[PDB]
Specification:
- It is classed as cytosolic protein.
- The entry lists the keywords oxidative stress, Keap1-Nrf2 system, inhibitor complex, cytosolic protein.
- The assembly is monomeric.
- Crystal structure of Keap1 in complex with dimethyl fumarate (DMF).
- The structure is a monomer.
- The protein has 295 residues and is mainly beta.
- It has one domain.
- It contains no helices and 30 strands.
- A 4-stranded antiparallel beta sheet has the order 5-4-1-30, with no helix packed on it. Strands 6-7-10-11 form a 4-stranded antiparallel beta sheet, with no helix packed on it. Strands 12-13-16-17 form a 4-stranded antiparallel beta sheet, with no helix packed on it.
- Bound molecules: dimethyl (~{E})-but-2-enedioate (EOU) (3 copies).
- One dimethyl (~{E})-but-2-enedioate binds next to loops.
Length: 295
Amino acid sequence: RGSHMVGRLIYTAGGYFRQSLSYLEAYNPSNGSWLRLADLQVPRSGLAGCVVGGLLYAVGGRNNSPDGNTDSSALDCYNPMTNQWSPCASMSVPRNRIGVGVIDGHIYAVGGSHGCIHHSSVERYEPERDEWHLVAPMLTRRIGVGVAVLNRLLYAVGGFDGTNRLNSAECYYPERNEWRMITPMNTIRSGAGVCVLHNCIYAAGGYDGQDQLNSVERYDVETETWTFVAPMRHHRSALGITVHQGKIYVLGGYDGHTFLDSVECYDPDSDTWSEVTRMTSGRSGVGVAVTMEPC
Ligand SMILES: COC(=O)/C=C/C(=O)OC
Ligand SMILES: COC(=O)/C=C/C(=O)OC
Ligand SMILES: COC(=O)/C=C/C(=O)OC
């Protein structure tokens, strides 16, 4: 898979170490290299990343800084061809510890917190019109929620509702604008990395109310059951996650002791995790997505 005429990189945006971060860095699995690119205009942790039409989007989060703490409603777009960030229309509400998924070229922003309240609301961005619109809210308030898309359906997995961390999960059916509960995970997880590989939704890591997790489980949408696979080498919560050429990559996080620079890669063929690189510095709460090499 080469986009146009160049390779695809794993982009990590933002994050947290002592304070919220503005870093944008790109990792190349083909040769091991890291590139530092244009900083975010506003530092942010607890954001999500996604790609539509080759462009990288940074959604939500919070600027934890000495000068103050501000939850973000921002949507910002990075163009690899220009190495520049551009503001887009802002969401209806600030959303820290947000989850994001893409269906049919549209960005869904799910859940997250604003101050002391925990959202169940969901809204959808149309890049063609630069507009957000609210859709049906989830059945559950969720922050630290993992999101993934499979077969043009949107899934919201785990999180924290303001009192309890959650093992529950739910699915959104766009043509009925309706959420439905699915089978709950076997583990309570907030701040897990959630992605899709083949016909399964993976939930890696997270926080269960006492411990950061290294376990990984996957939901087979045909069987409606969750099964554990190999655990990661590191326990981690608030990790970044993405898929690149058939493998899962997890980036950073917090293990109860250190903000991790470790990047691990899961090979589904062998059911093994391996360390593949280190980020340039340890951090948690990053947004991650995959698109073309920059100029
Ligand atoms: C923005 O993300 C955070 O502030 C998380 C910090 C943490 O759990 O490390 C002790
Ligand atoms: C052009 O509209 C699209 O749906 C493109 C999506 C994309 O770039 O996949 C990572
Ligand atoms: C309020 O409870 C916590 O300490 C949360 C820890 C966490 O999110 O994992 C690193």
